[PDB]
Short mmCIF file of N, CA, C and O and ligand atoms in Angstrom, two decimals:
data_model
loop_
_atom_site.label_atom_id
_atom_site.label_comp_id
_atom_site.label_asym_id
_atom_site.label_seq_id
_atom_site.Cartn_x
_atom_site.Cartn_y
_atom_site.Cartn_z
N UNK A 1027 95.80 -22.62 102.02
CA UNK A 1027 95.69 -22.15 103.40
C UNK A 1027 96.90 -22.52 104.24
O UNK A 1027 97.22 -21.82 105.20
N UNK A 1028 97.70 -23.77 103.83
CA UNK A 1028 98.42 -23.60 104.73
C UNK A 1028 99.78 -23.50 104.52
O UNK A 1028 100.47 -23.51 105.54
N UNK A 1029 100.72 -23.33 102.76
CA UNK A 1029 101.57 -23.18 102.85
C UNK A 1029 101.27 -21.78 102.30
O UNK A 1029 102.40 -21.28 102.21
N UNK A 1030 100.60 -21.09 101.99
CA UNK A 1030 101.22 -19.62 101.62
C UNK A 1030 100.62 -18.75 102.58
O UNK A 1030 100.93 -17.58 102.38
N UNK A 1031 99.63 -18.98 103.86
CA UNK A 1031 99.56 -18.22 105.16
C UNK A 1031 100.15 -18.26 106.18
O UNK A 1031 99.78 -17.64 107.18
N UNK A 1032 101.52 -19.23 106.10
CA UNK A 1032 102.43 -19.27 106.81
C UNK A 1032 103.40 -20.38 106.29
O UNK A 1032 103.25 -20.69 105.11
N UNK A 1033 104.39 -21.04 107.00
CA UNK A 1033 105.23 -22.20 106.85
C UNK A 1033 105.01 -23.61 107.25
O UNK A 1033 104.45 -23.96 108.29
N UNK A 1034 105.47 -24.36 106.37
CA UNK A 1034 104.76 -25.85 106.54
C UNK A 1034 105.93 -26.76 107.07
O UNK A 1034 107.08 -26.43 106.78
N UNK A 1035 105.79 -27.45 107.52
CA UNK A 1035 106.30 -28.55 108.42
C UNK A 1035 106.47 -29.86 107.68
O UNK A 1035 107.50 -30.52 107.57
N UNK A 1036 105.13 -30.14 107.14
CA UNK A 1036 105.18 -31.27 106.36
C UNK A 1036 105.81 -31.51 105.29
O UNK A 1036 105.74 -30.84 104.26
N UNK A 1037 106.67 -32.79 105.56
CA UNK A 1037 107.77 -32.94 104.37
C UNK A 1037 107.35 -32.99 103.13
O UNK A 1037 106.23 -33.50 103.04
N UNK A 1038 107.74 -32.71 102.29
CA UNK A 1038 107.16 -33.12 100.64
C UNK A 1038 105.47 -32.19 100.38
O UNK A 1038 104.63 -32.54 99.55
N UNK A 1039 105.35 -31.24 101.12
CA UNK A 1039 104.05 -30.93 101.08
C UNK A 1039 103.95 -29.60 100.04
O UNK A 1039 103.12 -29.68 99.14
N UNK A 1040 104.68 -28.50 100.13
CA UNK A 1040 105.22 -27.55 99.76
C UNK A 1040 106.10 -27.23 99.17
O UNK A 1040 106.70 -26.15 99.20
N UNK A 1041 106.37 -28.69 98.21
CA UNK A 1041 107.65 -28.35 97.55
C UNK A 1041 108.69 -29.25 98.13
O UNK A 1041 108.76 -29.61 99.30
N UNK A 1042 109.57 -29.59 97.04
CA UNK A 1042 110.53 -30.66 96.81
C UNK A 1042 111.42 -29.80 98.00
O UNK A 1042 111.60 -28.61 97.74
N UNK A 1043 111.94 -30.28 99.19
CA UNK A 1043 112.96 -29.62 100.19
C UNK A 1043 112.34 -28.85 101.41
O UNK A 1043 111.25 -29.07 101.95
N UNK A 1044 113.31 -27.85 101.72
CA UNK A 1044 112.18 -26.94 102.84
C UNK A 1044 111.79 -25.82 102.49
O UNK A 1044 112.47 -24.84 102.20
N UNK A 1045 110.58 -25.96 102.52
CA UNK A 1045 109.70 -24.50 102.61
C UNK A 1045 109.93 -23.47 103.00
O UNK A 1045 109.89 -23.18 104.19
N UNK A 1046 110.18 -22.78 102.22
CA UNK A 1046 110.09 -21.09 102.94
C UNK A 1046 108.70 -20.19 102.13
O UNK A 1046 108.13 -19.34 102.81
N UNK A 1047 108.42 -20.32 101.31
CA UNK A 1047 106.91 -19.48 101.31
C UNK A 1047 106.40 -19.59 99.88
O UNK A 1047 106.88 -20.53 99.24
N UNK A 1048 105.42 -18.71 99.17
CA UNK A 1048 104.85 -19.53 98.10
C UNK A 1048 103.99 -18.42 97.50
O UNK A 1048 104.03 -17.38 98.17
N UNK A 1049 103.28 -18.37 96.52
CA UNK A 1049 102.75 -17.51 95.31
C UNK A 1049 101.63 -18.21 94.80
O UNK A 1049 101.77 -19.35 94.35
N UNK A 1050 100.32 -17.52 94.82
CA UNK A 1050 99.73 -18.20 93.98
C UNK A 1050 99.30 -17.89 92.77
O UNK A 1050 99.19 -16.66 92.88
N UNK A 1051 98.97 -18.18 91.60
CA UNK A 1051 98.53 -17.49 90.26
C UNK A 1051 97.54 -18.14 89.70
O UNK A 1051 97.49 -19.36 89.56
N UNK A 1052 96.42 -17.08 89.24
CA UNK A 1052 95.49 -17.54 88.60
C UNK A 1052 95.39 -18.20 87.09
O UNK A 1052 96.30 -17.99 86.29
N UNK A 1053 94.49 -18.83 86.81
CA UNK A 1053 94.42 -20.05 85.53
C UNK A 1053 93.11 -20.56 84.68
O UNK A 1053 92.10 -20.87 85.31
N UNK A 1054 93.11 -20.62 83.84
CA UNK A 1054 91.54 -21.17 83.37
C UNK A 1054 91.21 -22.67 84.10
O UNK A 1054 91.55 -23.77 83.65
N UNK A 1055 90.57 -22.42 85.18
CA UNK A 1055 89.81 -23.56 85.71
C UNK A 1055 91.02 -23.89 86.75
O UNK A 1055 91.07 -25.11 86.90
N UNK A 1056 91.81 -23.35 87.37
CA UNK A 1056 92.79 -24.17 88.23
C UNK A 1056 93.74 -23.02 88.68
O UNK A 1056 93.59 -21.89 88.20
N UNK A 1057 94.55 -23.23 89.44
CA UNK A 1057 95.64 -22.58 90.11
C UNK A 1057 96.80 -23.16 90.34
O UNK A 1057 96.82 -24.26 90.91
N UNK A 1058 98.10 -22.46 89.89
CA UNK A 1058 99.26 -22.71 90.28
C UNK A 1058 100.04 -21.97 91.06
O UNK A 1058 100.01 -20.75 90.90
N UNK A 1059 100.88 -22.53 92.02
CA UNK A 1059 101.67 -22.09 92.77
C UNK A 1059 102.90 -22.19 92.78
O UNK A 1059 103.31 -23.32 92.49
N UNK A 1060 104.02 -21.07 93.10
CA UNK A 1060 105.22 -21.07 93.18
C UNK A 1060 106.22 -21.48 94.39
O UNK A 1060 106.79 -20.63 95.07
N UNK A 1061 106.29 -22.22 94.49
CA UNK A 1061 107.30 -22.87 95.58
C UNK A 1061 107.93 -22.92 96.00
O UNK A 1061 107.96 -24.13 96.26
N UNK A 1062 108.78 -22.48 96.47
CA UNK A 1062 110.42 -21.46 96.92
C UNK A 1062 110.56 -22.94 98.08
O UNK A 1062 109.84 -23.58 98.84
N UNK A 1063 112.16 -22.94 97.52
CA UNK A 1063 112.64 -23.88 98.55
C UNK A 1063 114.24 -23.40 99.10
O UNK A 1063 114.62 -22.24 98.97
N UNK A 1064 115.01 -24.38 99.66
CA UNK A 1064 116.07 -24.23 100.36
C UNK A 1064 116.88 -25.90 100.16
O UNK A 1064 116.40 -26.96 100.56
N UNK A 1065 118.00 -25.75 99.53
CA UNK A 1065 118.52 -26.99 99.25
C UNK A 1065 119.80 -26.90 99.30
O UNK A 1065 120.48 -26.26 98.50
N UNK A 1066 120.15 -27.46 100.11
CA UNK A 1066 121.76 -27.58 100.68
C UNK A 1066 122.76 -28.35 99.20
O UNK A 1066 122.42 -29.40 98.65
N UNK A 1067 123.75 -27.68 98.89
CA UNK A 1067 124.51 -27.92 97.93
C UNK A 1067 125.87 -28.51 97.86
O UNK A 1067 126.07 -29.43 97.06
N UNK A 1068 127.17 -27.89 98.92
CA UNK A 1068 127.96 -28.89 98.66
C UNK A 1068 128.17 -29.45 99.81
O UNK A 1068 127.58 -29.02 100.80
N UNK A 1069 129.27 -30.79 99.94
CA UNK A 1069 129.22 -31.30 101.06
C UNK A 1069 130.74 -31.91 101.05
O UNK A 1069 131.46 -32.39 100.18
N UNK A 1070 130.86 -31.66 102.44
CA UNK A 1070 132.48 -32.14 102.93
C UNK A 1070 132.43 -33.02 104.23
O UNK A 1070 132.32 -32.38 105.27
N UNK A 1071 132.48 -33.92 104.30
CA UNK A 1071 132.33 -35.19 105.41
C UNK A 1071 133.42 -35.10 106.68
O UNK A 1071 134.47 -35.67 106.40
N UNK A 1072 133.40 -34.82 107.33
CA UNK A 1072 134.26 -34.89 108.99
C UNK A 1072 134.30 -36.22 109.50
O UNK A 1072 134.02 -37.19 108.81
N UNK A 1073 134.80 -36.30 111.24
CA UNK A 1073 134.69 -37.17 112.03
C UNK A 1073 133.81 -36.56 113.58
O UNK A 1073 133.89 -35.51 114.22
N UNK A 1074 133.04 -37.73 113.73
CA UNK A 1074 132.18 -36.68 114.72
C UNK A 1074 132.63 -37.60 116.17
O UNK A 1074 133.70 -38.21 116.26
N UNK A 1075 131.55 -37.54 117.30
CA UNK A 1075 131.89 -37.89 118.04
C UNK A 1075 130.58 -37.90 119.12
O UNK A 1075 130.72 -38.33 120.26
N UNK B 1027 91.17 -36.20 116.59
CA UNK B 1027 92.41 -37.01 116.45
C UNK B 1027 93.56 -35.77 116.59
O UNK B 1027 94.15 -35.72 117.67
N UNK B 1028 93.84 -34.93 115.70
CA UNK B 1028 94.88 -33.48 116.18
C UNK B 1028 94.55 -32.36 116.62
O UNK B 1028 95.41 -31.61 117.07
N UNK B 1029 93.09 -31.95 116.57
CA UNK B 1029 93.04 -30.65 117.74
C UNK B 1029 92.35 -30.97 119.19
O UNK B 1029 92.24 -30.26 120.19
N UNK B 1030 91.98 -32.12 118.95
CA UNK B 1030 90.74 -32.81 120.11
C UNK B 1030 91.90 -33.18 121.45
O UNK B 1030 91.76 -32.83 122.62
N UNK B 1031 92.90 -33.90 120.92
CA UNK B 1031 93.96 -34.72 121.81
C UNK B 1031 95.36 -34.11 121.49
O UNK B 1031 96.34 -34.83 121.65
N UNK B 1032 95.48 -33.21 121.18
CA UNK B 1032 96.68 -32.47 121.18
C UNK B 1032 96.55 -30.75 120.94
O UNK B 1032 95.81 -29.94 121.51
N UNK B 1033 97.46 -30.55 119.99
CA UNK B 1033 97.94 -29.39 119.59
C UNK B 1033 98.32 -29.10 117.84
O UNK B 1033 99.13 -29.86 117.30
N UNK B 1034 97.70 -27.97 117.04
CA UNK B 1034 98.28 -28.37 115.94
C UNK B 1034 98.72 -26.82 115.57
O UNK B 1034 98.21 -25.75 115.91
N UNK B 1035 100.20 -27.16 114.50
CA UNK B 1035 100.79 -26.18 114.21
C UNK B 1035 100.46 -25.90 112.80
O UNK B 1035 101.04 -25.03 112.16
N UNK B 1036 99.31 -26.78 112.23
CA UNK B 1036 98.69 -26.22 110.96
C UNK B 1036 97.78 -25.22 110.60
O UNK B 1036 96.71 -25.14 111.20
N UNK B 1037 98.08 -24.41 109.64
CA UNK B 1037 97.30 -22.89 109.71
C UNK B 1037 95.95 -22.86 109.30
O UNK B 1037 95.68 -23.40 108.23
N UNK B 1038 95.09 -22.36 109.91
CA UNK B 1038 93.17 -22.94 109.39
C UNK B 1038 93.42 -24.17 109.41
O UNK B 1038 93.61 -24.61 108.28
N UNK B 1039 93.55 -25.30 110.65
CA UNK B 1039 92.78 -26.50 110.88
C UNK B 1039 91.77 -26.26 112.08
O UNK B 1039 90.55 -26.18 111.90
N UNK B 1040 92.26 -26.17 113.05
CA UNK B 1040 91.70 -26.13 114.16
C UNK B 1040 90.69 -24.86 114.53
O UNK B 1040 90.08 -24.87 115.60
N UNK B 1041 90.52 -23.49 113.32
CA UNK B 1041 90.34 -22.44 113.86
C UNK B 1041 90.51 -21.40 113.12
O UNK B 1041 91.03 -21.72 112.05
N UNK B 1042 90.23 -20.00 113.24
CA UNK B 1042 91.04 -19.38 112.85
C UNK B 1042 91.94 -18.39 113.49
O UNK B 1042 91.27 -17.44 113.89
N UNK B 1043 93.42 -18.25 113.78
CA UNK B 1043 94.03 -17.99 114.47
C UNK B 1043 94.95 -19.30 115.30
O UNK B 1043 94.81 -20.53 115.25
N UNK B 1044 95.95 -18.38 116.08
CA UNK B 1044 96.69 -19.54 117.09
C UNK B 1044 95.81 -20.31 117.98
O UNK B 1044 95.32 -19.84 119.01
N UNK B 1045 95.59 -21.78 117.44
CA UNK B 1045 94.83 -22.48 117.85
C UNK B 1045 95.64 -22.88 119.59
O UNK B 1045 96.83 -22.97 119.88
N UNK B 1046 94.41 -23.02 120.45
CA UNK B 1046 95.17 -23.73 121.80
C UNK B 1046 94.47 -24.80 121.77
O UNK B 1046 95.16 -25.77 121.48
N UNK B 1047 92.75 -25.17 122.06
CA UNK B 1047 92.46 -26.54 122.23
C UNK B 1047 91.02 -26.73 121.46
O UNK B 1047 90.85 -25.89 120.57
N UNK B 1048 89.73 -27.90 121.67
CA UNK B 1048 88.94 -27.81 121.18
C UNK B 1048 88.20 -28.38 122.69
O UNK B 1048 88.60 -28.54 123.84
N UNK B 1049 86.81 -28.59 121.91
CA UNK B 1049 86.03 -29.50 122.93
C UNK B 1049 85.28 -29.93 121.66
O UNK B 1049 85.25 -29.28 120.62
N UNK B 1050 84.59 -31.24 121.91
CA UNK B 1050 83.65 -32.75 120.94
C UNK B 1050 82.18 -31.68 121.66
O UNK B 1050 82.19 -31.21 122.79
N UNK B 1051 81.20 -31.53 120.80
CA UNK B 1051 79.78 -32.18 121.10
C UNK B 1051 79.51 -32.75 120.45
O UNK B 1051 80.29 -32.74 119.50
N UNK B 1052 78.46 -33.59 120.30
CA UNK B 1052 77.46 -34.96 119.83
C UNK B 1052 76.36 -33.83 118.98
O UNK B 1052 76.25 -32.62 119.19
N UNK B 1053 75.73 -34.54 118.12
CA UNK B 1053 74.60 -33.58 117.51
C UNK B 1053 74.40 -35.13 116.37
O UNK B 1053 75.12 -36.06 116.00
N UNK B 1054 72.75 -34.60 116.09
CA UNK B 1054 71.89 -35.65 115.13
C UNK B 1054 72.60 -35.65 113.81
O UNK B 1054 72.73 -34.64 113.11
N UNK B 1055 73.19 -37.24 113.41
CA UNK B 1055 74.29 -37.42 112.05
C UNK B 1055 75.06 -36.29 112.41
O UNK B 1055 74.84 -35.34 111.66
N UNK B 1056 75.97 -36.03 113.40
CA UNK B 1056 77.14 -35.19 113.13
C UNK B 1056 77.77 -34.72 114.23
O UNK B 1056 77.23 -34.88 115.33
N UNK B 1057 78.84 -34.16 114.12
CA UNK B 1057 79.61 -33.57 115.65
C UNK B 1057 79.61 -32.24 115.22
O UNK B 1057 79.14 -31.84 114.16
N UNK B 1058 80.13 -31.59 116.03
CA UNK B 1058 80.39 -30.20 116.33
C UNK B 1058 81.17 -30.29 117.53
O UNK B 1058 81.14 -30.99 118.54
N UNK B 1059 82.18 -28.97 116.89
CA UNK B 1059 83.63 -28.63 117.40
C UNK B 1059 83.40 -27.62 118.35
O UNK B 1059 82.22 -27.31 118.50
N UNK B 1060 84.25 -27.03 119.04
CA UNK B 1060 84.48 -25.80 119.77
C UNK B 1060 85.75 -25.37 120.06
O UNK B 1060 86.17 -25.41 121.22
N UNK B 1061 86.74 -24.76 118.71
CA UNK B 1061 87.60 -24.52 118.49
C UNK B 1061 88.02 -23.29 119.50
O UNK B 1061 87.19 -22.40 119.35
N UNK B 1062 88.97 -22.94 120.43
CA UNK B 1062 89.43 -22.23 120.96
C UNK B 1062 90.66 -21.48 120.47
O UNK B 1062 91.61 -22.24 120.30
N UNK B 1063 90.86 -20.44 120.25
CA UNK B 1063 91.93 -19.53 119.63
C UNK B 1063 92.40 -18.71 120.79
O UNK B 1063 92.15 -18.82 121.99
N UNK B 1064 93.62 -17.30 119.69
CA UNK B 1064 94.45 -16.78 120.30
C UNK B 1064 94.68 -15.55 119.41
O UNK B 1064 95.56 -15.67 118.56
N UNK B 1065 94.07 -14.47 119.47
CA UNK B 1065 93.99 -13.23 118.41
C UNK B 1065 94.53 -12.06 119.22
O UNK B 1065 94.15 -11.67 120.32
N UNK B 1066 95.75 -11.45 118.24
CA UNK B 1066 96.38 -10.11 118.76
C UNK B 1066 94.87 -9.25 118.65
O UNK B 1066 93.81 -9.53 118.09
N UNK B 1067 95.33 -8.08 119.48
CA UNK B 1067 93.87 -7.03 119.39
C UNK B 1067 94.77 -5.72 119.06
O UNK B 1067 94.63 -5.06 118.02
N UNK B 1068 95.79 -5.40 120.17
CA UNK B 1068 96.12 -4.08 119.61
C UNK B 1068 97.41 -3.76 119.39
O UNK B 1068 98.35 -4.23 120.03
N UNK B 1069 97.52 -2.75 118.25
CA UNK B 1069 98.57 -2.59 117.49
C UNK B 1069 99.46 -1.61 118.26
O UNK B 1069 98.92 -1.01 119.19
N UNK B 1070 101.07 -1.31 117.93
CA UNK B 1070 101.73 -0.02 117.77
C UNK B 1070 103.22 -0.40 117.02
O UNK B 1070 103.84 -1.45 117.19
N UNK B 1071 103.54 0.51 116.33
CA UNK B 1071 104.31 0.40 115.58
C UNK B 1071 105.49 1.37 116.09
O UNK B 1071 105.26 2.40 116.72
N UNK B 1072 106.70 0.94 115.77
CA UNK B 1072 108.08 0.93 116.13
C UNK B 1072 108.95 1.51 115.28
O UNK B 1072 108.52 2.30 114.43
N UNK B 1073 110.26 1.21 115.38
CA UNK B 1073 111.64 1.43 114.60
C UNK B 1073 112.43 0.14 115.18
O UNK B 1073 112.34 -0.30 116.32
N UNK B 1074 113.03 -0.26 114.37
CA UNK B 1074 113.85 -1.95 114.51
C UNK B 1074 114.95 -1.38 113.52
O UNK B 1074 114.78 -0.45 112.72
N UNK B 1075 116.07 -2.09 113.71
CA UNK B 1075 117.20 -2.75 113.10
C UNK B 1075 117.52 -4.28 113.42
O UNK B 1075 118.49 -4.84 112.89
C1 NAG C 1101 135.14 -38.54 103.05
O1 NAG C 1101 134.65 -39.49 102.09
C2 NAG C 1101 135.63 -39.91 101.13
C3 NAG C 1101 134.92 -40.83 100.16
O2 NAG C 1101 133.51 -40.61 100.18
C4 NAG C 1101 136.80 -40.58 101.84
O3 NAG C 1101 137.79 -40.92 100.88
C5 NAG C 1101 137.39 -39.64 102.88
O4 NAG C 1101 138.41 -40.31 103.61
C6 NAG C 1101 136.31 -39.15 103.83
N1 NAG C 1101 136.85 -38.19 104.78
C7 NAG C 1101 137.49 -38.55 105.90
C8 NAG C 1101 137.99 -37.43 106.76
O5 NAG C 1101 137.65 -39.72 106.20
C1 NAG C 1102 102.59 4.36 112.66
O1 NAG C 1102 101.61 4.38 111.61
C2 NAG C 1102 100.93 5.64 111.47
C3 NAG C 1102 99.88 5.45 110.40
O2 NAG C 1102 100.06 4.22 109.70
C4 NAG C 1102 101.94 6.73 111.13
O3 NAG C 1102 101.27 7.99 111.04
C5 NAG C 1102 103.03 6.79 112.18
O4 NAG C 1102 104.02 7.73 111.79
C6 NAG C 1102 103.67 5.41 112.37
N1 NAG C 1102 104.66 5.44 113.44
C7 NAG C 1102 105.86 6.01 113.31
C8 NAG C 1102 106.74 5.95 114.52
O5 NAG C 1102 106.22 6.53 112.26
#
């Protein structure tokens, strides 16, 4: 109900990173879901201020 | 504790639909809610870029 009828807030709830939306699939006795995330990759360090 | 004394941005907690507030009643072994919402009614459809 609440990460694949909209977007979740809660950290670590929906998937390792940030949430953007989700899938569910049926299973003998259980359900799995697909987890789509967003994960920042390279990084170059500045001076801030 | 989050729809009673605030506001929540979680989807089906408070309701169904854009939740705004609640109200507490008392009842024998138990409470009862009075979830207040926020439901579109009417449609029309467009052209976007
Ligand atoms: C960025 O970090 C590296 C080591 O992590 C450092 O050598 C470099 O000076 C840093 N960048 C700046 C602009 O100081
Ligand atoms: C809006 O939807 C109706 C039926 O779904 C359709 O007939 C109509 O053409 C749509 N509006 C536009 C501007 O196409």
């Amino acid at each position: 109900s609440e990460c694949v009828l909209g977007q979740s807030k809660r950290v670590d709830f929906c998937g390792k990173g940030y949430h953007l939306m989700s899938f569910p699939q049926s299973a003998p006795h259980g359900v799995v879901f697909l987890h789509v995330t967003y994960v920042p990759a390279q990084e170059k360090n500045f001076t801030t201020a």
